[PDB]
Amino acid sequence: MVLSEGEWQLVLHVWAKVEADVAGHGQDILIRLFKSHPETLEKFDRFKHLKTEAEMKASEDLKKVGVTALTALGAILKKKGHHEAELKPLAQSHATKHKIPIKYLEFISEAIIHVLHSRHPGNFGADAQGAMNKALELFRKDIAAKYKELGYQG
Ligand code: HEM
Ligand SMILES: OC[C@H]1O[C@@](CO)(O[C@H]2O[C@H](CO)[C@@H](O)[C@H](O)[C@H]2O)[C@@H](O)[C@@H]1O
Numbered sequence: 001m002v003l004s005e006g007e008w009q010l011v012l013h014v015w016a017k018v019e020a021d022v023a024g025h026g027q028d029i030l031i032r033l034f035k036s037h038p039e040t041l042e043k044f045d046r047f048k049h050l051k052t053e054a055e056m057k058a059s060e061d062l063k064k065v066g067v068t069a070l071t072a073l074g075a076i077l078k079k080k081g082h083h084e085a086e087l088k089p090l091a092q093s094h095a096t097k098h099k100i101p102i103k104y105l106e107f108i109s110e111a112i113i114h115v116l117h118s119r120h121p122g123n124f125g126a127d128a129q130g131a132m133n134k135a136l137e138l139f140r141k142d143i144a145a146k147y148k149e150l151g152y153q154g
Contacts, residue, residue, distance in 0.1 A: 001141065003134055008080045010131035014116055014123040015077055018070065025115060026066020031056050032111040040104050069108075077135060083142070091146035095154065102144050102154040109136040 003011075018025045031053055034041045042048050044065070050056050072090060076083045094100040113132060116124045124132075147154040 001134065001138055003081060003131065003138065005080075007131040007134060010128040011077055011135045014120055014128055014132065015074055017120050017123055018116070019074065022070050022074075023063050023067050025119070026070045027057060027063055028115045028119070029070070029108070029111045030062055030066045032114055033108050036111065037104070037107045040107060043098060043100060043104070073112075073139075076139060081138060083139070087139075087143055087146055091143050092150060094143070095147045095150045095152035099152075102140060102147070105140050105143065109133075109140065112136065 034050075034056065035053065041050070044062075046065075047056075047059055047061050050059060050062070056062055072086070076086050079086060113129060113136075116132065117129065144154055
């Protein structure tokens with residue numbers, strides 16, 4: 001699968017708005033993930049004990065983890081599909097150390113889409129959401145292939 005340049009521009013135009021406040025977007029996305037799919041919180045040994053949305057919002061550790069994830073994803077998106085180098089360390093850590101199944105990458109992709117739809121209706125209409133879905137599907141397809149090369153079914 002290959003995105004067109006027009007599709008990449010829709011992706012990068014909404015990402016530019018995320019970048020006004022990466023920390024706040026990361027909080028919203030992780031909280032949505034943990035509320036919609038509580039099993040995913042168990043993978044974060046550093047804050048898996050958090051019990052409520054209020055505790056999640058107050059956690060500086062959770063905020064920093066959200067910034068780190070969205071910054072890595074932004075760098076991938078800006079490569080417009082030419083992301084082989086960026087996926088290597090990420091696939092290795094997520095397959096081998098953190099043990100994150102592809103299904104959980106689907107869950108975080110849904111959380112990203114949900115939050116962008118809520119926060120950015122001016123830059124996240126139907127065509128823009130479809131382009132972002134196609135970019136996240138490409139990311140997950142390529143990471144899944146790397147997982148398999150690395151010895152993890154995912
Ligand atoms: C867009 C998808 C994601 C991106 C770009 C991403 C990126 C990152 C980065 C850059 C790190 C730090 C370096 C590393 O260890 O590789 C990290 C750490 C981590 N990631 Fe992800 N991640 C993603 C999705 C997920 C998901 C869905 C989970 C769990 C359900 C997860 C679990 C973890 C854990 C447990 C750590 C260690 C966190 C800590 O230091 O406390 N990641 N991730
Ligand atoms: O590059 C591997 C890995 O490191 C992270 C932080 O966990 O990003 C760091 O390295 C990038 C490439 O050199 C820099 O652009 C970035 O500023 C730096 O923090 C992850 O994003 C990435 O997967």
